[PDB]
Amino acid sequence: MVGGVV
Ligand SMILES: O=C(O)C(F)(F)C(F)(F)F
């Protein structure tokens, strides 16, 4: 999985 970036 590629985590989101905020
Ligand atoms: O981590 C994932 O979901 C994946 F698709 F396997 C990646 F290719 F990005 F590594």
Tab-separated table of C-alpha atoms and ligand atoms in Angstrom:
chain	number	residue	atom	x	y	z
A	1	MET	CA	0.000	0.000	0.000
A	2	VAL	CA	1.138	3.577	-0.680
A	3	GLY	CA	0.067	5.850	2.131
A	4	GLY	CA	-1.456	9.220	1.453
A	5	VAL	CA	0.371	12.507	1.814
A	6	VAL	CA	-1.164	15.578	3.438
B	1	LIG	O1	2.129	-1.166	-2.413
B	1	LIG	C1	1.307	-1.410	-3.335
B	1	LIG	O2	0.046	-1.409	-3.172
B	1	LIG	C2	1.884	-1.785	-4.693
B	1	LIG	F1	0.931	-1.657	-5.665
B	1	LIG	F2	2.256	-3.095	-4.666
B	1	LIG	C3	3.112	-0.965	-5.086
B	1	LIG	F3	3.435	-1.257	-6.370
B	1	LIG	F4	2.841	0.359	-5.047
B	1	LIG	F5	4.183	-1.228	-4.289
